[PDB]
Amino acid sequence: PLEVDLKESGEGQGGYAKEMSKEFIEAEMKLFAQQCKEVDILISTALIPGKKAPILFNKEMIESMKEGSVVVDLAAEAGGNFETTKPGEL
Amino acid sequence: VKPGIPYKQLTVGVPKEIFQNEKRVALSPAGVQALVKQGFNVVVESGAGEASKFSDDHYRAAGAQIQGAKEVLASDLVVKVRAPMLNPTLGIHEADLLKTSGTLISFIYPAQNPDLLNKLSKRNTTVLAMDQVPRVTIAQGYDALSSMANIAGYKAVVLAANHFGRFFTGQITAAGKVPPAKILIVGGGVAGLASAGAAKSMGAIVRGFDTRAAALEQFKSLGAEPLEVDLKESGEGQGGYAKEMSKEFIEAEMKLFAQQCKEVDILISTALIPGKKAPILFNKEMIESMKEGSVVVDLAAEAGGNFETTKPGELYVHKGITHIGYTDLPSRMATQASTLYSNNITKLLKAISPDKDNFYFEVKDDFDFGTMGHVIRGTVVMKDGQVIFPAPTPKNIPQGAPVKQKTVAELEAEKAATITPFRKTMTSASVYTAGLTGILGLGIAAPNLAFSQMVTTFGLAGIVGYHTVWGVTPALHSPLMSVTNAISGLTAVGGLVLMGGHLYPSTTSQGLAALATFISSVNIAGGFLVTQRMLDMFKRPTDPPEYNYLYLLPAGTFVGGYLASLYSGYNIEQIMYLGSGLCCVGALAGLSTQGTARLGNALGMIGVAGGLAATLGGLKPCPELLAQMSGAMALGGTIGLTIAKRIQISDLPQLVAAFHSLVGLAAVLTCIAEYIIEYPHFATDAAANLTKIVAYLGTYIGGVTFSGSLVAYGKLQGILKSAPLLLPGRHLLNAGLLAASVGGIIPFMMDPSFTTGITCLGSVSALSAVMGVTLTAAIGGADMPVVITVLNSYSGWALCAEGFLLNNNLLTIVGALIGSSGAILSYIMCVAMNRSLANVILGGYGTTSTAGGKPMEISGTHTEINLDNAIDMIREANSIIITPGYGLCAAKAQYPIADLVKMLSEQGKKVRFGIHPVAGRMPGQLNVLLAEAGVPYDIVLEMDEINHDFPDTDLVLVIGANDTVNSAAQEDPNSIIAGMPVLEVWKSKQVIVMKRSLGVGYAAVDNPIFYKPNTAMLLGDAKKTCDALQAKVRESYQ
Ligand SMILES: CCCCCCCCCCCCCCCCCC(=O)OC[C@H](COP(=O)([O-])OCC[N+](C)(C)C)OC(=O)CCCCCCCCCCCCCCCCC
Ligand SMILES: CCCCCCCCCCCCCCCCCC(=O)OC[C@H](COP(=O)([O-])OCC[N+](C)(C)C)OC(=O)CCCCCCCCCCCCCCCCC
Ligand SMILES: NC(=O)c1ccc[n+]([C@@H]2O[C@H](COP(=O)([O-])OP(=O)(O)OC[C@H]3O[C@@H](n4cnc5c(N)ncnc54)[C@H](OP(=O)(O)O)[C@@H]3O)[C@@H](O)[C@H]2O)c1
Ligand SMILES: NC(=O)c1ccc[n+]([C@@H]2O[C@H](COP(=O)([O-])OP(=O)(O)OC[C@H]3O[C@@H](n4cnc5c(N)ncnc54)[C@H](O)[C@@H]3O)[C@@H](O)[C@H]2O)c1
Ligand SMILES: CCCCCCCCCCCC
Ligand SMILES: CCCCCCCCCCCC
C-alpha cells in the first residue's frame, strides 16, 4: 500500500469515492511521477461516480517509462485516466 | 609465449537478422558491458535491438560503437541468433560478407544444412554451434535450447489464456461456483515443466504425462497429476532421452489421451524424439470430441507435429477448438529471449578461454567425459574450413553410474531395524526388574525409619528435579548453571550444625566446620551476584518497568514469620526446610520463560535465607558462638561479592569451575568432621554403619569434585596446556585407583578403631583427588565443558551425601535438584554432538556413528572475495542468518556484530541469529555474550528452531564456526563427526565464511562447504572485518 503526504478523507457519502482537491491531485501525480520510472505494468481503475474519470498521468509522465512497458486503462469509456488514450484500440 | 591472440586486437559483432519476423537480438547491453569488461571491442549494427526493445543509446552507454551493416559481419567474432542466409537487401549471401579467419556463434543445425557448411568451408572459417553443446553438468549455464524451451513453455501458457474464454483459478463468490480449468501437458522436458509451473501457479490443475520414469516424478514434485498407462514397458532413450516406442504402446497411449481428451480444456503437446519427427498422438476424431471453445497448443510444430490438424503458424478456429501452432514462439518474448541468449553466449565465451588478454580454446579429441574438452569438441562443428561435425564418443562414462553412498541416517536405519521387537521389551523389562530389585536392596539395608523417609523424599525430589530442568529455556542454560552454584552453597547448613565452642573454635572438628561455612558463604554470595548480573543483560530496553523489590514482601514475612514464632515457643524447622526446598524448586522453575527469570533468582534467595535461618535458629547458639557463625558467613559473603562483581562474562566458565571445588572441599570437610564428632557413639548405635558408608561416599565425591574442578580451572584459564596429556598405562592405573577406593571400605568396616577409620578417610580423600586429576587431565581443552557439567552433578550428589548423613531434608531436596540439572545438561551436550560419556571421558576416536576408516576426499577449489563484494552481497540480500562460534567471542567481535544487526534491522531486513548447542565453552554461553553485546533475545534462535528456515534465506554469515556447519556430518559415514547435528548453511543462497586461513578446526580435517560454489571465503581476523563491515554500512547509508 502506497501513501501520500496529505491527510484528506477520500470517502464521500458512502462506500463510493468523491472528487479530490487540486492540491491532493497534484501530490498524487507527484507520487505517480516518482514511481512511474520504476514499474513495468500499470493498471488504472479510477472511476468517480457522478462525472468523468480523473486525469492522473500526463503525456510526459508516461513517456518516462522503460522502452516496452504496457499501460492498461480500464476507465476508457468514462473518459480515461490518461491524456494519451485512444478509447478503443491498441 | 601464450598461444592466443589478445583481447584488444579482436572485435565481436552483432548483426541484425534478415530472417522473416525475427525479433530477438544476439547480445543485450548487459552482455555488452561484459566482453568489454573482458577485453573485446564491440560493434553493433544500427537497427539491431528495436524489435527486442533495446535502443542504440544503451549500446553506446555500454561501451560499444554503433556502425553499419557490411563492417559488422567483417569482424573477428560474429555473434548471431540463427544461421546466415540470403540477404535480399544487399543481394549477396551473408557468408560471403564474413572475413577470412573469422568466428561464428550461431544455431547452425549441421545435420540439416550441408550447403551452409559448404559456403562456410569455402571461406575458411571456424564455426561454433550453440545447438551442439552436450547436456552435461558443467555446461548447463550455457544451454540455449533449454532457455528457448523455458520461454516457449511460458509463452504457450500465456497464449493459452487470452484465447481461452474462462478463468483458470475459479472462485467461490456469492454469485455462483465457477470450476477451475483443466490442462493436460503431453511430455515434460523443459517446456513441459515450464508450462506445468506456469499453469499451476496461475490457478488451474495439471494432469500431465511423459514416457520417461523421471519426468513423472518431476511432475509430482511440481504438483501435477502423473498419468499411467496399462501397457507397462520400459522408457527407452539411452543417455536420458526418448526413443520411438512400440505400436501397441502408441495405440494404448492414444486410448488414454482419447479418454482424457473429452474432459480437459487446454491441451499443450510437447512430445519430441531426437533425430525423428514428433509422434502423431492425436487424431481428428480424437480432437473434435473436445468441448467447444477449447485451446490446443502444439509446441512441436517445427519438427512435424503431434496432431493430424496443425497448420504450422496459423490460428484457424476449426469448429470451436482453437489450434495454436506457432513455430517461432520465443520470438514473441524477444526481450527475455535476447537476455537469456546473451547470458548463454557470455557464459560460453567466459568459459572456453578462462584467461586474461588471450583467447585460445584448444580443440582436442582425447574425450574425457564431464570435462570441458568434451564441450569444446562437441560445440565446434568447423575448424579452418575442415568440417569436424561427427564428434567421436567420450572415453569413460561417469554421471550415470549408480555407486552413490547412502547418507548417515540411512545407515542408522539398518541399526534401528535390526533390533527385534522381542529384545526391546526384554531389555525394558530387564531395566525395570533391576530398578525394583535395587529398591528392595535399599530396603533390606535400612537401619531405621529415618533412612526410609529420606530415601522417599530423595526419590521424589529427584523426579521433581528431572521434570523442572527440562522445562528451562535453552537460552538460559548458563544462568541455570549459576543458580545451581548459588544454591549449592547450602553446604554451610552442614557446617553450622557441626560448629561449636565460643567466639573461637575449641576442637579440630569445630575448625573444619568453620572452614566449610566460610567457603560455602563464598559460593552463596558469588552465585547470586553473577546470576543477577547475567539476568539483567537479557532485559530489553523496550520492556516495561519491573519492580523486583516487591519480592521483599514474601521474604520479609517468611523468615520474619519464622522468628516471631521462634519468639513464641514453636519449632518450625522441618516445615521451613520444605518451604526452602519449594522456593529453590521455584528458582529453577521460573527460569523457563524469560519473563519469569528474575522471579527465579528471588525465590532462590528466599529459599537460601530461609534454610540458613532455620538451621541457625534450631540450634539456639550462645551469643559468642553466633558471633563466630555470623563472622564466618560475613567474611565468606564479602569475598564472594567482591569476586562476582569484578569479572567479565567471558571468564564465566572458570568461575563456575572455581565454585564446584569449594563445594567439593566443604563436603570433605563436613564428612571427616562428622566422623570425629560422632566417633564415641558407634558403640551404642544401631545406625553406626550407615553414617560411615555415607561419610565415606561423601568424602570420595567431594575429593573427586575438588581436584577435577581445579584441573578444569587450570586448563580453561590457560595455565595448563590444553592438550590431552596421556599417561602410558592410564586405564590400568584408573582401574587400580577405583579398585583401591572401592576396596578401602572393607578395612573401614570390620574394625571399630579410630586410627583405622581416620586413615581410611584420609586415604579415600587422597585417592579421589588423584583420580580427579588423572581423569581430568586426559580430556582435552575443547570437550572441557563436559567436565564443567559432570562435576556440576557431583557437587549435587555430595549434598545428598551431606543430607543422608545429617538427617536433613533440605540438603537432599537441593542435592537431587542440582544433580539432575548437571546430568541433564551433560546429556544435552553429549547428544548435541554424537559422542557418549564413555567416549568423552575415557577417550575414544570420533563418534558413535562413524564406521571403518578413510573419509572421502575433497573436491574443487574455494571462492575467495574481499570486503567490497561481501558488502555489495549483503546489500542485495533481504534475509540474513548469522551463525556465530567461539571465534567471534575470543576476538571480542560481538559488539560490531550487534551494531551491524541493529543497523540492518533499521532498514527493514530480517536478521536473525542461529545458535548451535555446543558453540562456546559452557552451555548457553553464546546467548549471554550476544545479550551483553546488546542483541534482543527474540532474534536469537536455537539450532532446532532455525534449521528449517535455511532454504528460504538470502544470506548466511558464518563467523568463527567450523564443525557446527560441516556437511560431512550428514553425507560421509567415515568422518570423525559423522552424525553430529549441524547448522545446514549450504542450503541457502550465499554463504560468507570469515576465518584466518584455510586450515582445520578441532577435528574434521577439511570442511566440504568451503569448496562449494555457493560459498565465498572472506579471510582475515574477525574483529577487523566486522569493524570494516560496520564502518561500510555506516558510511554507505548515513
Ligand atoms: C527490606 C525489608 C525486610 C526484608 C527482610 C527479608 C530477609 C532477607 C532476605 C534477603 C534475600 C532477598 C529477598 C528476595 C529478593 C528481593 C528482590 C531482589 O533482590 O531484587 C533484585 C534487586 C534489584 O535488581 P536490579 O535488577 O534492579 O539490578 C540492580 C542491581 N544492584 C542493586 C546491585 C545495582 O537487587 C538487589 O536487591 C541486589 C542484587 C541482588 C543480590 C546480590 C547479593 C546476593 C547475596 C546472597 C543472597 C541472600 C542469601 C541469604 C543470606 C542472608 C541475607 C539476609
Ligand atoms: C549419596 C547419594 C548418592 C546418589 C547418587 C545417585 C546417582 C544418580 C545418577 C543419575 C544419572 C544417570 C544417567 C543415565 C543416563 C542414561 C542416558 C541414556 O539413555 O543413554 C543412551 C543414549 C543413547 O542415545 P540416544 O540419542 O538414543 O538417546 C536415548 C533417546 N531415547 C531414549 C528416546 C531413545 O546415549 C547417549 O545419548 C550418549 C550419552 C549417554 C550419557 C550422557 C550423560 C548421562 C548423565 C551423566 C551425568 C553424571 C552422572 C553422575 C553419577 C553420580 C554417581 C555418584
Ligand atoms: N560448547 C560446549 O559446551 C562444548 C562441549 C564439548 C565440546 N565442545 C566442542 O566445541 C566445538 C565447537 O565447534 P566449532 O566449529 O564452533 O569450533 P572450532 O571448529 O574449534 O572453531 C571455529 C573456527 O573459528 C576460527 N577462529 C578461531 N578464532 C578466531 C578468531 N579470533 N577470529 C576469527 N576466526 C577465528 C578457527 O579457524 P581458523 O583458525 O583456521 O581461522 C576455528 O577453526 C565442538 O566441535 C566440540 O568439540 C563444546
Ligand atoms: N542439468 C540437467 O540435468 C539437464 C539440463 C538440460 C536438459 N536435461 C535433460 O534433457 C532433457 C530436456 O528435455 P527437452 O525438452 O530439452 O527435450 P525434448 O524437446 O526432446 O523433450 C520432449 C519431451 O517429450 C517426451 N516424449 C517423447 N516421446 C513421447 C511420447 N511418445 N509420449 C509422451 N512424451 C514423449 C520426452 O520424454 C521429453 O520429455 C531431459 O531428458 C533432461 O533430463 C538435463
Ligand atoms: C545398590 C543399592 C543397595 C544394595 C544393597 C544390597 C544389600 C545390602 C545389605 C547390607 C546389610 C544389611
Ligand atoms: C551394613 C549396613 C549397610 C547400610 C548402608 C548400605 C548402603 C546405603 C547407601 C544409601 C545411599 C548413600
Coordinates of C-alpha atoms in Angstrom, one line a residue, chain B residues 518-769:
Chain B
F518 CA 33.3 -19.9 55.1
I519 CA 33.8 -21.3 51.6
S520 CA 30.0 -22.1 51.3
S521 CA 29.2 -18.5 52.0
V522 CA 31.6 -17.6 49.2
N523 CA 29.5 -19.9 46.9
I524 CA 26.2 -18.3 48.0
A525 CA 27.2 -14.7 47.5
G526 CA 29.1 -15.3 44.3
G527 CA 26.4 -17.3 42.6
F528 CA 23.6 -14.9 43.4
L529 CA 25.6 -11.8 42.1
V530 CA 26.6 -13.5 38.9
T531 CA 23.0 -14.7 38.4
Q532 CA 21.6 -11.2 38.9
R533 CA 24.3 -9.7 36.6
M534 CA 23.5 -12.2 33.9
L535 CA 19.8 -11.8 34.1
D536 CA 20.0 -8.0 33.8
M537 CA 21.6 -8.3 30.4
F538 CA 18.6 -10.1 28.8
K539 CA 16.5 -7.0 29.8
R540 CA 15.3 -5.4 26.6
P541 CA 15.2 -1.5 26.8
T542 CA 11.6 -1.6 25.5
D543 CA 10.4 -3.8 28.3
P544 CA 8.0 -2.4 30.9
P545 CA 9.5 -1.3 34.2
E546 CA 9.6 -4.2 36.6
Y547 CA 9.5 -3.8 40.4
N548 CA 11.7 -6.5 41.9
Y549 CA 11.8 -5.0 45.4
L550 CA 8.2 -6.2 45.9
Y551 CA 9.6 -9.7 46.3
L552 CA 10.9 -8.4 49.6
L553 CA 7.3 -8.8 50.7
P554 CA 7.3 -12.7 50.9
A555 CA 10.9 -12.9 52.3
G556 CA 10.1 -10.3 55.0
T557 CA 7.1 -12.4 56.1
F558 CA 8.8 -15.8 55.6
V559 CA 11.9 -15.5 57.8
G560 CA 10.1 -12.7 59.6
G561 CA 7.3 -15.1 60.1
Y562 CA 9.8 -17.6 61.4
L563 CA 11.4 -15.6 64.2
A564 CA 8.1 -14.3 65.5
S565 CA 7.2 -18.0 66.0
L566 CA 10.7 -18.6 67.3
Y567 CA 9.9 -15.9 69.9
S568 CA 6.8 -17.9 70.8
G569 CA 7.8 -21.4 71.8
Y570 CA 7.3 -23.1 68.4
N571 CA 9.6 -25.4 66.4
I572 CA 9.0 -25.0 62.7
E573 CA 12.3 -26.2 61.3
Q574 CA 11.1 -29.4 59.4
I575 CA 8.5 -27.2 57.7
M576 CA 10.9 -24.4 57.0
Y577 CA 13.0 -27.0 55.2
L578 CA 10.0 -27.8 53.0
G579 CA 9.4 -24.1 52.3
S580 CA 13.0 -23.5 51.4
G581 CA 13.1 -26.6 49.2
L582 CA 10.0 -25.4 47.3
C583 CA 11.5 -21.9 46.9
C584 CA 14.7 -23.5 45.5
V585 CA 12.5 -25.5 43.1
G586 CA 10.7 -22.3 42.0
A587 CA 14.1 -20.7 41.5
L588 CA 14.7 -23.2 38.6
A589 CA 11.1 -23.5 37.5
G590 CA 10.7 -19.7 37.0
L591 CA 13.8 -19.7 34.8
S592 CA 11.9 -21.1 31.9
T593 CA 10.0 -18.3 30.2
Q594 CA 12.4 -15.2 30.0
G595 CA 9.5 -13.2 31.5
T596 CA 9.7 -15.0 34.9
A597 CA 13.5 -15.3 35.0
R598 CA 14.0 -12.6 37.7
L599 CA 11.5 -14.4 39.9
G600 CA 13.7 -17.5 39.6
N601 CA 16.6 -15.6 41.3
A602 CA 14.5 -14.0 44.1
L603 CA 12.9 -17.3 45.1
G604 CA 16.3 -18.9 45.3
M605 CA 17.5 -16.1 47.6
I606 CA 14.4 -16.5 49.8
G607 CA 15.0 -20.3 49.9
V608 CA 18.6 -20.0 50.9
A609 CA 17.8 -17.3 53.5
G610 CA 15.0 -19.5 55.0
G611 CA 17.2 -22.5 55.1
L612 CA 20.1 -20.7 56.9
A613 CA 17.6 -19.0 59.3
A614 CA 16.0 -22.4 60.1
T615 CA 19.4 -24.1 60.8
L616 CA 20.6 -21.0 62.7
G617 CA 17.5 -20.9 64.9
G618 CA 17.1 -24.6 65.5
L619 CA 20.4 -24.8 67.3
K620 CA 19.9 -22.0 69.8
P621 CA 23.5 -20.7 69.8
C622 CA 25.1 -18.7 72.6
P623 CA 25.9 -15.0 71.7
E624 CA 29.6 -15.6 71.2
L625 CA 29.2 -18.7 69.0
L626 CA 26.5 -16.9 66.9
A627 CA 29.1 -14.1 66.5
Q628 CA 31.6 -16.7 65.1
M629 CA 28.9 -18.0 62.8
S630 CA 27.9 -14.5 61.5
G631 CA 31.6 -13.5 61.1
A632 CA 32.4 -16.6 59.0
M633 CA 29.4 -16.1 56.8
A634 CA 30.1 -12.3 56.5
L635 CA 33.7 -12.8 55.5
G636 CA 32.8 -15.5 53.0
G637 CA 30.0 -13.4 51.6
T638 CA 32.2 -10.4 51.3
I639 CA 34.8 -12.4 49.3
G640 CA 32.0 -13.8 47.1
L641 CA 30.5 -10.3 46.5
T642 CA 33.9 -8.8 45.6
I643 CA 34.8 -11.7 43.2
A644 CA 31.4 -11.9 41.5
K645 CA 31.4 -8.2 40.5
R646 CA 34.9 -7.6 39.0
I647 CA 34.7 -10.4 36.5
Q648 CA 33.9 -10.3 32.8
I649 CA 31.2 -12.6 31.4
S650 CA 33.6 -14.4 29.1
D651 CA 35.6 -15.5 32.2
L652 CA 32.4 -17.1 33.5
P653 CA 33.3 -20.8 32.9
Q654 CA 36.5 -20.5 35.0
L655 CA 34.4 -19.1 37.9
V656 CA 32.0 -22.0 37.5
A657 CA 34.9 -24.3 37.6
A658 CA 36.1 -22.4 40.7
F659 CA 32.8 -23.0 42.5
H660 CA 32.5 -26.8 42.5
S661 CA 35.9 -27.2 44.2
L662 CA 34.6 -25.1 47.0
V663 CA 31.5 -27.3 47.1
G664 CA 33.8 -30.4 47.0
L665 CA 36.2 -29.4 49.7
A666 CA 33.4 -28.3 52.1
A667 CA 31.8 -31.7 51.6
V668 CA 35.0 -33.5 52.6
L669 CA 35.4 -31.0 55.5
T670 CA 31.9 -32.0 56.6
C671 CA 32.2 -35.7 56.4
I672 CA 35.6 -36.2 58.2
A673 CA 34.3 -33.7 60.8
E674 CA 31.2 -35.8 61.5
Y675 CA 33.4 -38.9 61.7
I676 CA 35.2 -37.1 64.6
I677 CA 32.2 -35.7 66.4
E678 CA 30.3 -39.0 66.4
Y679 CA 33.1 -41.5 66.9
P680 CA 32.5 -42.3 70.6
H681 CA 28.8 -43.1 69.7
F682 CA 29.4 -46.0 67.4
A683 CA 29.2 -48.5 70.3
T684 CA 25.6 -47.7 71.3
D685 CA 24.0 -47.1 67.9
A686 CA 22.2 -49.4 65.5
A687 CA 22.8 -47.0 62.6
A688 CA 26.5 -46.9 63.2
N689 CA 27.3 -48.4 59.8
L690 CA 25.0 -46.1 57.6
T691 CA 26.7 -43.0 58.9
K692 CA 30.1 -44.4 58.0
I693 CA 29.0 -45.6 54.5
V694 CA 27.6 -42.1 53.7
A695 CA 30.7 -40.4 55.2
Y696 CA 33.0 -42.5 53.0
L697 CA 30.9 -41.8 49.9
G698 CA 30.7 -38.1 50.5
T699 CA 34.4 -37.9 51.1
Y700 CA 35.0 -39.7 47.8
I701 CA 32.6 -37.5 45.8
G702 CA 34.0 -34.3 47.3
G703 CA 37.6 -35.3 46.7
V704 CA 36.9 -36.1 43.0
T705 CA 34.9 -32.8 42.6
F706 CA 37.6 -30.6 44.2
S707 CA 40.6 -31.8 42.2
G708 CA 38.7 -32.3 38.9
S709 CA 37.3 -28.7 39.1
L710 CA 40.8 -27.4 40.0
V711 CA 42.3 -29.1 36.9
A712 CA 39.3 -27.8 34.8
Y713 CA 40.0 -24.2 36.0
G714 CA 43.7 -24.6 35.3
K715 CA 43.0 -25.8 31.7
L716 CA 40.3 -23.2 31.0
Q717 CA 42.4 -20.3 32.3
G718 CA 45.5 -21.1 30.2
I719 CA 47.8 -22.2 33.0
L720 CA 47.9 -25.9 32.0
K721 CA 48.4 -26.8 28.3
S722 CA 45.1 -27.6 26.6
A723 CA 46.5 -30.9 25.1
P724 CA 45.2 -34.3 26.5
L725 CA 48.2 -35.5 28.5
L726 CA 48.1 -39.3 28.2
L727 CA 49.9 -41.4 30.7
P728 CA 51.4 -44.7 29.2
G729 CA 49.1 -47.1 31.1
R730 CA 46.1 -45.0 32.1
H731 CA 43.2 -47.4 32.1
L732 CA 45.1 -49.9 34.3
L733 CA 46.0 -47.0 36.6
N734 CA 42.4 -45.7 36.8
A735 CA 41.1 -49.2 37.4
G736 CA 43.6 -49.8 40.1
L737 CA 42.6 -46.5 41.8
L738 CA 39.0 -47.4 41.6
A739 CA 39.7 -50.8 42.9
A740 CA 41.6 -49.4 45.9
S741 CA 38.8 -46.8 46.5
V742 CA 36.1 -49.4 46.4
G743 CA 38.0 -52.0 48.4
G744 CA 39.1 -49.5 51.1
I745 CA 35.6 -49.6 52.6
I746 CA 36.3 -53.2 53.8
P747 CA 39.1 -52.1 56.2
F748 CA 36.9 -49.1 57.1
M749 CA 34.2 -51.6 58.2
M750 CA 35.1 -54.7 60.3
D751 CA 37.3 -52.5 62.7
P752 CA 35.9 -50.1 65.3
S753 CA 39.3 -48.4 65.8
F754 CA 39.7 -44.6 65.4
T755 CA 43.2 -44.6 63.7
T756 CA 42.0 -47.1 61.1
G757 CA 38.9 -45.1 60.3
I758 CA 40.7 -41.8 60.0
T759 CA 43.4 -43.3 57.8
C760 CA 40.7 -44.8 55.6
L761 CA 39.1 -41.3 55.3
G762 CA 42.4 -39.7 54.5
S763 CA 43.3 -42.4 52.0
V764 CA 40.0 -42.2 50.2
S765 CA 40.2 -38.4 50.0
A766 CA 43.8 -38.6 48.6
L767 CA 42.8 -41.4 46.1
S768 CA 39.7 -39.4 45.0
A769 CA 41.8 -36.3 44.4

